[PDB]
Amino acid sequence: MRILAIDTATEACSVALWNNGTINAHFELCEHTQRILPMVQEILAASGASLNEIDALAFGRGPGSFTGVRIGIGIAQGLALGANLPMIGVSTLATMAQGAWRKTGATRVLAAIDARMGEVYWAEYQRDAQGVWQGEETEAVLKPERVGERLKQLSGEWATVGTGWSAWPDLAKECGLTLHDGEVSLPAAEDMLPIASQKLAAGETVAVEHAEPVYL
């Protein structure tokens, strides 16, 4: 089964294709559109796959750039609609947590995105025994001050991901947790795949008209 993933939620622009484990992905910094179509077409030609054949299109539902996310979803809805494909919304936070697992093996992650105007998109994600990232209900838009306040309520060791940490260097400083560097600052489509894969298996897909950015 195949899954095409696209993301434009943050400063990064990426596309990836899942084909029974085998992955074809493209990543780069970005205009959040002029590069997507060529990437999509690049990946499809590379893997020698047709949009019509794919089983589902995974889209970056954010949170991230208010404009960035909406653009990626629009193109994703177009690609999926013209090919009668189910869509799967993947969290930008969870996506990065998957990235930390891949690069460091971290199973507990604190995701913090440096949102504009001194705001931070926050999430506490913990991978369970089935390999599923738990904690989606913890996603939120917070003030740096409120985050450091949260940290004091957590315990154990965690890996950190997101631009939020570099933006607010004292967060990891003043907390009594054991923090490890998740080595992931921005989301990658290749990381959305594993998560999309499991959601597809659980049948958590949405029709094109229901694909929307997450609201926090």
Next chain:
Amino acid sequence: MRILAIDTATEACSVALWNNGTINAHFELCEHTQRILPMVQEILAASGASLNEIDALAFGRGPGSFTGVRIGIGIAQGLALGANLPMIGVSTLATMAQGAWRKTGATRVLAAIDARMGEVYWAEYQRDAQGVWQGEETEAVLKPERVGERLKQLSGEWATVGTGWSAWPDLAKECGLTLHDGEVSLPAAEDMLPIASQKLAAGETVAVEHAEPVYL
């Protein structure tokens, strides 16, 4: 044969479907994306048509909002790629001229778009005997002053279209031409269809990777 047209080149956002003359269109002022997909899906359900069945997707290639045009094209490329559809680029200027013909019958049109920072997208379009708008080579980005300069070189009666005239009220004032009001200020997808129809008949389509905004 069916043709789906979408445009987001200017402040207006519209979609239309051509089915052997019969047309289903939607028009409104606009975020240049949150409304497109629903419109597309609205039109498809209304006419009871499937993307896969359509014969070609017409896109507004501009000139217009640098950002607006690129967004519409991206979604159009997605819809067309997922459905293996040929694409047809339709000029925003010619589109409005078609609009003047529809509302007033004008066969000679002077299109002027009020571009930002005191600039104007200009075009002289004249409908020939076959019903084809001639003058595409006259499209250009000009300074108000250069436009009024051009006008003095034209002759006969013309209909005016575009936001450019209201932005620069002296253009139609100082010229010795016989100008009629084209009654069209912004482009409508429904007007792209006739033009797309003829280009399709002439085989002037482009592959998804070749759909790009016009550069003037």
